[PDB]
Amino acid sequence: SMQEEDTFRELRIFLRNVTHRLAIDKRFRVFTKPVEVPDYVTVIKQPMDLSSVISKIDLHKYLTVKDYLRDIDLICSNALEYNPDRDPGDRLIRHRACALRDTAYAIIKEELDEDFEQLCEEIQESR
Ligand SMILES: CC(=O)c1nc(NC(=O)[C@@H](C)N)sc1-c1cncc(N)c1
Ligand SMILES: CC(=O)c1nc(NC(=O)[C@@H](C)N)sc1-c1cncc(N)c1
């Protein structure tokens, strides 16, 4: 229905705004573009980055905030797995990756209405 389509459009508008606020943050520049380094493709089976997230929003791939946060969590978990060493370069990326994840979750906790996320879930489960 039109009411359901309007609901998913509001979700996309919200997700674009959150992703924009993450992508303009200087700490998260490393996560804004797809991966220069030839061993990434063999360590990371599903690359994810904020530009790819924006593309998925516009392709209507996220019907719930949980769908979106799964890809934020993938950005973070990929970074922790590809950068596990004690070296300062690894530790810096791990710190930024957890900050990206924590920032996304915090924006959603403070700004997304629980009843709006619940409606999205109940429409998606009906399909
Ligand atoms: C989802 C909703 O807010 C809604 N609202 C209505 N009434 C209204 O006056 C419009 C302006 N909300 S009808 C309707 C509705 C639409 N598609 C499926 C189901 N289950 C309900
Ligand atoms: C597309 C993307 O990944 C993106 N990257 C940015 N990078 C930066 O600002 C620098 C600091 N890395 S800003 C930004 C962006 C995201 N959503 C909406 C708009 N208008 C821009």
GROMACS .gro file of N, CA and C and ligand atoms in nm:
model
  423
    1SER      N    1   0.082  -0.122   0.000
    1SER     CA    2   0.000   0.000   0.000
    1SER      C    3   0.085   0.126   0.000
    2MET      N    4   0.018   0.239  -0.023
    2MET     CA    5   0.087   0.368  -0.022
    2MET      C    6   0.140   0.401   0.117
    3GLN      N    7   0.064   0.367   0.222
    3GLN     CA    8   0.111   0.392   0.357
    3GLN      C    9   0.239   0.313   0.387
    4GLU      N   10   0.247   0.189   0.338
    4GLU     CA   11   0.369   0.111   0.359
    4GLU      C   12   0.486   0.166   0.278
    5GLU      N   13   0.461   0.205   0.153
    5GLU     CA   14   0.567   0.265   0.074
    5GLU      C   15   0.618   0.394   0.137
    6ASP      N   16   0.527   0.475   0.194
    6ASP     CA   17   0.568   0.597   0.264
    6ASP      C   18   0.655   0.564   0.385
    7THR      N   19   0.623   0.454   0.454
    7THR     CA   20   0.702   0.414   0.571
    7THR      C   21   0.844   0.380   0.530
    8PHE      N   22   0.859   0.298   0.425
    8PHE     CA   23   0.993   0.263   0.381
    8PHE      C   24   1.067   0.384   0.326
    9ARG      N   25   0.998   0.478   0.263
    9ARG     CA   26   1.068   0.597   0.216
    9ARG      C   27   1.120   0.680   0.333
   10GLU      N   28   1.041   0.693   0.440
   10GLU     CA   29   1.090   0.767   0.557
   10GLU      C   30   1.211   0.696   0.617
   11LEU      N   31   1.209   0.562   0.619
   11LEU     CA   32   1.325   0.488   0.669
   11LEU      C   33   1.449   0.519   0.584
   12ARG      N   34   1.435   0.519   0.451
   12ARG     CA   35   1.550   0.551   0.366
   12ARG      C   36   1.604   0.691   0.391
   13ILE      N   37   1.514   0.789   0.406
   13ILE     CA   38   1.556   0.926   0.435
   13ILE      C   39   1.634   0.931   0.566
   14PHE      N   40   1.584   0.862   0.670
   14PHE     CA   41   1.655   0.858   0.797
   14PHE      C   42   1.792   0.792   0.782
   15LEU      N   43   1.798   0.678   0.711
   15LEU     CA   44   1.925   0.607   0.696
   15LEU      C   45   2.027   0.687   0.615
   16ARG      N   46   1.982   0.758   0.511
   16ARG     CA   47   2.074   0.843   0.436
   16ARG      C   48   2.132   0.951   0.525
   17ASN      N   49   2.049   1.009   0.613
   17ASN     CA   50   2.099   1.115   0.700
   17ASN      C   51   2.201   1.062   0.800
   18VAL      N   52   2.174   0.947   0.862
   18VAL     CA   53   2.270   0.886   0.954
   18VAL      C   54   2.400   0.855   0.881
   19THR      N   55   2.390   0.793   0.763
   19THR     CA   56   2.511   0.754   0.691
   19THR      C   57   2.592   0.875   0.649
   20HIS      N   58   2.524   0.983   0.607
   20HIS     CA   59   2.593   1.107   0.574
   20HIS      C   60   2.670   1.161   0.694
   21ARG      N   61   2.608   1.156   0.813
   21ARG     CA   62   2.675   1.209   0.931
   21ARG      C   63   2.796   1.125   0.970
   22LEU      N   64   2.791   0.993   0.946
   22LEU     CA   65   2.910   0.910   0.965
   22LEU      C   66   3.016   0.940   0.861
   23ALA      N   67   2.976   0.956   0.735
   23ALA     CA   68   3.073   0.967   0.626
   23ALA      C   69   3.149   1.099   0.628
   24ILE      N   70   3.091   1.206   0.683
   24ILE     CA   71   3.162   1.333   0.687
   24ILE      C   72   3.255   1.343   0.807
   25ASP      N   73   3.251   1.246   0.898
   25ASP     CA   74   3.337   1.244   1.015
   25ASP      C   75   3.478   1.201   0.974
   26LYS      N   76   3.578   1.285   1.004
   26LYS     CA   77   3.715   1.258   0.960
   26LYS      C   78   3.767   1.125   1.013
   27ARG      N   79   3.723   1.084   1.132
   27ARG     CA   80   3.770   0.957   1.189
   27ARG      C   81   3.733   0.838   1.102
   28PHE      N   82   3.627   0.851   1.023
   28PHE     CA   83   3.571   0.737   0.952
   28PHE      C   84   3.605   0.738   0.804
   29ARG      N   85   3.698   0.824   0.762
   29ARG     CA   86   3.735   0.832   0.621
   29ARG      C   87   3.777   0.696   0.565
   30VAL      N   88   3.844   0.614   0.646
   30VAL     CA   89   3.892   0.484   0.599
   30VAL      C   90   3.776   0.393   0.559
   31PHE      N   91   3.657   0.418   0.611
   31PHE     CA   92   3.541   0.333   0.585
   31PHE      C   93   3.448   0.390   0.478
   32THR      N   94   3.485   0.499   0.411
   32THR     CA   95   3.392   0.561   0.317
   32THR      C   96   3.398   0.504   0.176
   33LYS      N   97   3.506   0.436   0.139
   33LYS     CA   98   3.522   0.389   0.003
   33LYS      C   99   3.562   0.242   0.003
   34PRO      N  100   3.527   0.168  -0.102
   34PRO     CA  101   3.579   0.032  -0.115
   34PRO      C  102   3.731   0.033  -0.123
   35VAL      N  103   3.792  -0.071  -0.067
   35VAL     CA  104   3.937  -0.089  -0.074
   35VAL      C  105   3.981  -0.099  -0.220
   36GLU      N  106   4.565  -0.160  -0.484
   36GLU     CA  107   4.617  -0.092  -0.366
   36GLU      C  108   4.671  -0.193  -0.264
   37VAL      N  109   4.584  -0.283  -0.218
   37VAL     CA  110   4.626  -0.391  -0.129
   37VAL      C  111   4.563  -0.521  -0.179
   38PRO      N  112   4.644  -0.616  -0.226
   38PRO     CA  113   4.589  -0.733  -0.296
   38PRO      C  114   4.539  -0.844  -0.205
   39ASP      N  115   4.573  -0.843  -0.076
   39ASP     CA  116   4.532  -0.950   0.013
   39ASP      C  117   4.400  -0.923   0.084
   40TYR      N  118   4.333  -0.812   0.053
   40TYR     CA  119   4.205  -0.786   0.118
   40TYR      C  120   4.099  -0.884   0.071
   41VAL      N  121   4.097  -0.915  -0.059
   41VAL     CA  122   3.992  -0.998  -0.116
   41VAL      C  123   3.997  -1.142  -0.065
   42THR      N  124   4.113  -1.189  -0.021
   42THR     CA  125   4.123  -1.325   0.031
   42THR      C  126   4.099  -1.333   0.181
   43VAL      N  127   4.113  -1.222   0.253
   43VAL     CA  128   4.083  -1.219   0.395
   43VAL      C  129   3.938  -1.181   0.420
   44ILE      N  130   3.884  -1.091   0.338
   44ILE     CA  131   3.751  -1.035   0.360
   44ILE      C  132   3.661  -1.085   0.247
   45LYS      N  133   3.570  -1.176   0.282
   45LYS     CA  134   3.480  -1.236   0.184
   45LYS      C  135   3.365  -1.144   0.145
   46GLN      N  136   3.318  -1.058   0.236
   46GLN     CA  137   3.213  -0.962   0.205
   46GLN      C  138   3.259  -0.823   0.247
   47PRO      N  139   3.330  -0.752   0.159
   47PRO     CA  140   3.366  -0.613   0.189
   47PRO      C  141   3.241  -0.528   0.208
   48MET      N  142   3.253  -0.427   0.294
   48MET     CA  143   3.144  -0.333   0.315
   48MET      C  144   3.204  -0.199   0.352
   49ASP      N  145   3.140  -0.092   0.307
   49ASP     CA  146   3.188   0.044   0.328
   49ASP      C  147   3.068   0.137   0.317
   50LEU      N  148   3.087   0.263   0.358
   50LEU     CA  149   2.972   0.353   0.368
   50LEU      C  150   2.917   0.393   0.232
   51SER      N  151   3.001   0.399   0.128
   51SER     CA  152   2.949   0.424  -0.006
   51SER      C  153   2.860   0.310  -0.053
   52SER      N  154   2.899   0.185  -0.023
   52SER     CA  155   2.816   0.070  -0.059
   52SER      C  156   2.686   0.069   0.020
   53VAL      N  157   2.691   0.113   0.146
   53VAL     CA  158   2.569   0.127   0.226
   53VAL      C  159   2.473   0.226   0.161
   54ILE      N  160   2.525   0.342   0.117
   54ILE     CA  161   2.440   0.441   0.052
   54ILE      C  162   2.377   0.383  -0.074
   55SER      N  163   2.454   0.307  -0.152
   55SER     CA  164   2.399   0.243  -0.271
   55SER      C  165   2.287   0.147  -0.235
   56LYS      N  166   2.305   0.069  -0.129
   56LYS     CA  167   2.203  -0.026  -0.088
   56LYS      C  168   2.077   0.045  -0.040
   57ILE      N  169   2.091   0.160   0.027
   57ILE     CA  170   1.971   0.236   0.064
   57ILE      C  171   1.890   0.269  -0.060
   58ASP      N  172   1.958   0.323  -0.163
   58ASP     CA  173   1.889   0.369  -0.284
   58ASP      C  174   1.836   0.253  -0.367
   59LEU      N  175   1.894   0.133  -0.353
   59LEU     CA  176   1.840   0.013  -0.416
   59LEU      C  177   1.730  -0.053  -0.333
   60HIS      N  178   1.685   0.012  -0.225
   60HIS     CA  179   1.577  -0.037  -0.139
   60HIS      C  180   1.611  -0.172  -0.077
   61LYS      N  181   1.738  -0.190  -0.040
   61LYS     CA  182   1.780  -0.316   0.020
   61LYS      C  183   1.756  -0.321   0.170
   62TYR      N  184   1.734  -0.207   0.237
   62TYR     CA  185   1.711  -0.203   0.381
   62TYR      C  186   1.563  -0.175   0.406
   63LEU      N  187   1.492  -0.273   0.461
   63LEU     CA  188   1.353  -0.253   0.500
   63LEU      C  189   1.336  -0.232   0.649
   64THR      N  190   1.443  -0.251   0.727
   64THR     CA  191   1.439  -0.233   0.871
   64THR      C  192   1.571  -0.173   0.915
   65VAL      N  193   1.570  -0.111   1.033
   65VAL     CA  194   1.695  -0.058   1.085
   65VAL      C  195   1.790  -0.171   1.120
   66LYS      N  196   1.737  -0.288   1.159
   66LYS     CA  197   1.822  -0.404   1.183
   66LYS      C  198   1.900  -0.444   1.058
   67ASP      N  199   1.835  -0.441   0.940
   67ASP     CA  200   1.907  -0.469   0.816
   67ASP      C  201   2.025  -0.373   0.798
   68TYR      N  202   2.002  -0.245   0.824
   68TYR     CA  203   2.107  -0.144   0.809
   68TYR      C  204   2.220  -0.167   0.908
   69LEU      N  205   2.186  -0.190   1.035
   69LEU     CA  206   2.289  -0.206   1.137
   69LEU      C  207   2.370  -0.332   1.114
   70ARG      N  208   2.313  -0.432   1.047
   70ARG     CA  209   2.392  -0.550   1.012
   70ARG      C  210   2.509  -0.513   0.922
   71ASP      N  211   2.489  -0.418   0.829
   71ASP     CA  212   2.599  -0.377   0.742
   71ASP      C  213   2.696  -0.283   0.814
   72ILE      N  214   2.647  -0.198   0.905
   72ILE     CA  215   2.739  -0.122   0.991
   72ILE      C  216   2.825  -0.218   1.072
   73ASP      N  217   2.761  -0.320   1.132
   73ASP     CA  218   2.836  -0.419   1.209
   73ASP      C  219   2.938  -0.493   1.123
   74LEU      N  220   2.907  -0.515   0.995
   74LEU     CA  221   3.000  -0.582   0.904
   74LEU      C  222   3.121  -0.494   0.874
   75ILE      N  223   3.100  -0.364   0.852
   75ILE     CA  224   3.214  -0.272   0.838
   75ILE      C  225   3.306  -0.286   0.958
   76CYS      N  226   3.248  -0.287   1.078
   76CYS     CA  227   3.328  -0.291   1.200
   76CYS      C  228   3.398  -0.425   1.216
   77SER      N  229   3.324  -0.535   1.197
   77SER     CA  230   3.384  -0.666   1.220
   77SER      C  231   3.489  -0.699   1.115
   78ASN      N  232   3.469  -0.655   0.990
   78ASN     CA  233   3.573  -0.669   0.888
   78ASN      C  234   3.700  -0.597   0.932
   79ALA      N  235   3.686  -0.476   0.985
   79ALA     CA  236   3.804  -0.399   1.024
   79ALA      C  237   3.877  -0.465   1.140
   80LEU      N  238   3.803  -0.519   1.238
   80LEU     CA  239   3.867  -0.587   1.350
   80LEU      C  240   3.939  -0.713   1.304
   81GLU      N  241   3.883  -0.784   1.206
   81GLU     CA  242   3.944  -0.909   1.159
   81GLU      C  243   4.066  -0.884   1.070
   82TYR      N  244   4.058  -0.785   0.980
   82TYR     CA  245   4.172  -0.755   0.893
   82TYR      C  246   4.285  -0.685   0.968
   83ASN      N  247   4.258  -0.628   1.086
   83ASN     CA  248   4.355  -0.548   1.161
   83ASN      C  249   4.367  -0.598   1.304
   84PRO      N  250   4.414  -0.722   1.325
   84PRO     CA  251   4.414  -0.780   1.460
   84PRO      C  252   4.540  -0.756   1.542
   85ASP      N  253   4.644  -0.699   1.484
   85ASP     CA  254   4.777  -0.691   1.544
   85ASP      C  255   4.786  -0.579   1.647
   86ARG      N  256   4.892  -0.583   1.728
   86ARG     CA  257   4.914  -0.479   1.827
   86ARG      C  258   4.975  -0.353   1.768
   87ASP      N  259   5.017  -0.356   1.642
   87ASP     CA  260   5.082  -0.242   1.579
   87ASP      C  261   4.991  -0.120   1.580
   88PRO      N  262   5.048   0.001   1.587
   88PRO     CA  263   4.963   0.121   1.602
   88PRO      C  264   4.868   0.141   1.485
   89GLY      N  265   4.908   0.104   1.363
   89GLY     CA  266   4.816   0.118   1.250
   89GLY      C  267   4.692   0.033   1.267
   90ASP      N  268   4.711  -0.092   1.312
   90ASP     CA  269   4.598  -0.182   1.339
   90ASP      C  270   4.511  -0.128   1.452
   91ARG      N  271   4.573  -0.082   1.561
   91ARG     CA  272   4.495  -0.038   1.676
   91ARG      C  273   4.415   0.087   1.644
   92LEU      N  274   4.469   0.175   1.559
   92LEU     CA  275   4.396   0.295   1.520
   92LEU      C  276   4.271   0.260   1.440
   93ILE      N  277   4.283   0.167   1.345
   93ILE     CA  278   4.166   0.128   1.266
   93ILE      C  279   4.063   0.057   1.353
   94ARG      N  280   4.108  -0.028   1.446
   94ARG     CA  281   4.013  -0.094   1.535
   94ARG      C  282   3.939   0.009   1.620
   95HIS      N  283   4.010   0.111   1.668
   95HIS     CA  284   3.943   0.213   1.749
   95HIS      C  285   3.840   0.288   1.667
   96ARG      N  286   3.876   0.325   1.545
   96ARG     CA  287   3.782   0.397   1.458
   96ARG      C  288   3.662   0.310   1.422
   97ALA      N  289   3.686   0.180   1.400
   97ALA     CA  290   3.578   0.090   1.361
   97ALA      C  291   3.475   0.075   1.473
   98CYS      N  292   3.521   0.057   1.597
   98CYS     CA  293   3.428   0.050   1.708
   98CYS      C  294   3.359   0.184   1.731
   99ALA      N  295   3.430   0.295   1.709
   99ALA     CA  296   3.364   0.425   1.723
   99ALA      C  297   3.256   0.444   1.616
  100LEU      N  298   3.281   0.396   1.494
  100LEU     CA  299   3.179   0.404   1.390
  100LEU      C  300   3.054   0.326   1.430
  101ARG      N  301   3.073   0.202   1.474
  101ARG     CA  302   2.963   0.118   1.520
  101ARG      C  303   2.888   0.182   1.637
  102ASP      N  304   2.962   0.224   1.741
  102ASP     CA  305   2.898   0.284   1.858
  102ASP      C  306   2.824   0.413   1.822
  103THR      N  307   2.880   0.493   1.730
  103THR     CA  308   2.814   0.617   1.690
  103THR      C  309   2.683   0.588   1.616
  104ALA      N  310   2.685   0.494   1.521
  104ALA     CA  311   2.561   0.458   1.451
  104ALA      C  312   2.454   0.409   1.549
  105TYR      N  313   2.491   0.318   1.639
  105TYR     CA  314   2.393   0.268   1.735
  105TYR      C  315   2.339   0.379   1.823
  106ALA      N  316   2.425   0.474   1.863
  106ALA     CA  317   2.383   0.581   1.953
  106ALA      C  318   2.288   0.678   1.884
  107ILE      N  319   2.316   0.712   1.758
  107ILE     CA  320   2.226   0.799   1.683
  107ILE      C  321   2.089   0.734   1.671
  108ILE      N  322   2.088   0.604   1.640
  108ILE     CA  323   1.960   0.536   1.623
  108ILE      C  324   1.885   0.528   1.756
  109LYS      N  325   1.956   0.499   1.866
  109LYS     CA  326   1.890   0.492   1.996
  109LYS      C  327   1.825   0.624   2.033
  110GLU      N  328   1.891   0.735   2.003
  110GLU     CA  329   1.842   0.866   2.045
  110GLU      C  330   1.738   0.924   1.950
  111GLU      N  331   1.743   0.889   1.821
  111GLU     CA  332   1.665   0.962   1.720
  111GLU      C  333   1.561   0.879   1.646
  112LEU      N  334   1.567   0.747   1.651
  112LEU     CA  335   1.466   0.667   1.584
  112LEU      C  336   1.361   0.622   1.684
  113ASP      N  337   1.234   0.651   1.653
  113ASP     CA  338   1.125   0.610   1.741
  113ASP      C  339   1.110   0.458   1.738
  114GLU      N  340   1.098   0.398   1.857
  114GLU     CA  341   1.083   0.253   1.866
  114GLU      C  342   0.959   0.205   1.791
  115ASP      N  343   0.852   0.285   1.790
  115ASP     CA  344   0.731   0.246   1.719
  115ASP      C  345   0.749   0.256   1.568
  116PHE      N  346   0.837   0.345   1.522
  116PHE     CA  347   0.867   0.347   1.379
  116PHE      C  348   0.947   0.224   1.339
  117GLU      N  349   1.048   0.185   1.417
  117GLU     CA  350   1.123   0.065   1.380
  117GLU      C  351   1.033  -0.058   1.388
  118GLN      N  352   0.941  -0.061   1.485
  118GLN     CA  353   0.851  -0.176   1.496
  118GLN      C  354   0.759  -0.187   1.375
  119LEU      N  355   0.707  -0.074   1.326
  119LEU     CA  356   0.622  -0.078   1.207
  119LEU      C  357   0.698  -0.132   1.087
  120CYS      N  358   0.822  -0.085   1.066
  120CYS     CA  359   0.901  -0.137   0.955
  120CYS      C  360   0.915  -0.289   0.965
  121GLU      N  361   0.941  -0.340   1.085
  121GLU     CA  362   0.958  -0.483   1.104
  121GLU      C  363   0.829  -0.558   1.071
  122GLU      N  364   0.714  -0.504   1.112
  122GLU     CA  365   0.590  -0.577   1.089
  122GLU      C  366   0.547  -0.575   0.943
  123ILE      N  367   0.581  -0.470   0.868
  123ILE     CA  368   0.555  -0.472   0.725
  123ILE      C  369   0.645  -0.575   0.658
  124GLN      N  370   0.774  -0.573   0.692
  124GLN     CA  371   0.869  -0.663   0.626
  124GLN      C  372   0.836  -0.809   0.652
  125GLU      N  373   0.795  -0.841   0.775
  125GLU     CA  374   0.761  -0.979   0.809
  125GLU      C  375   0.637  -1.027   0.735
  126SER      N  376   0.547  -0.935   0.697
  126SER     CA  377   0.428  -0.975   0.624
  126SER      C  378   0.461  -1.014   0.480
  127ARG      N  379   0.568  -0.959   0.424
  127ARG     CA  380   0.608  -0.990   0.287
  127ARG      C  381   0.683  -1.123   0.283
  128LIG     C1  382  -0.028   0.182   0.782
  128LIG     C2  383  -0.128   0.292   0.813
  128LIG     O1  384  -0.094   0.388   0.882
  128LIG     C3  385  -0.250   0.290   0.758
  128LIG     N1  386  -0.319   0.401   0.786
  128LIG     C4  387  -0.441   0.408   0.733
  128LIG     N2  388  -0.523   0.512   0.751
  128LIG     C5  389  -0.483   0.640   0.722
  128LIG     O2  390  -0.558   0.736   0.739
  128LIG     C6  391  -0.342   0.667   0.663
  128LIG     C7  392  -0.325   0.815   0.630
  128LIG     N3  393  -0.236   0.624   0.757
  128LIG     S1  394  -0.471   0.269   0.648
  128LIG     C8  395  -0.316   0.199   0.682
  128LIG     C9  396  -0.274   0.080   0.636
  128LIG    C10  397  -0.221   0.074   0.507
  128LIG     N4  398  -0.174  -0.047   0.454
  128LIG    C11  399  -0.179  -0.163   0.531
  128LIG    C12  400  -0.231  -0.159   0.660
  128LIG     N5  401  -0.235  -0.271   0.734
  128LIG    C13  402  -0.277  -0.037   0.712
  129LIG     C1  403   2.927   0.941  -0.025
  129LIG     C2  404   3.021   0.930   0.095
  129LIG     O1  405   3.069   0.821   0.127
  129LIG     C3  406   3.060   1.044   0.156
  129LIG     N1  407   3.191   1.055   0.186
  129LIG     C4  408   3.227   1.168   0.246
  129LIG     N2  409   3.355   1.191   0.281
  129LIG     C5  410   3.395   1.304   0.343
  129LIG     O2  411   3.325   1.400   0.374
  129LIG     C6  412   3.545   1.305   0.375
  129LIG     C7  413   3.568   1.371   0.511
  129LIG     N3  414   3.594   1.167   0.375
  129LIG     S1  415   3.093   1.263   0.267
  129LIG     C8  416   2.986   1.151   0.195
  129LIG     C9  417   2.854   1.172   0.183
  129LIG    C10  418   2.763   1.077   0.230
  129LIG     N4  419   2.624   1.096   0.217
  129LIG    C11  420   2.577   1.213   0.156
  129LIG    C12  421   2.667   1.308   0.110
  129LIG     N5  422   2.621   1.419   0.053
  129LIG    C13  423   2.805   1.288   0.123
   0.00000   0.00000   0.00000
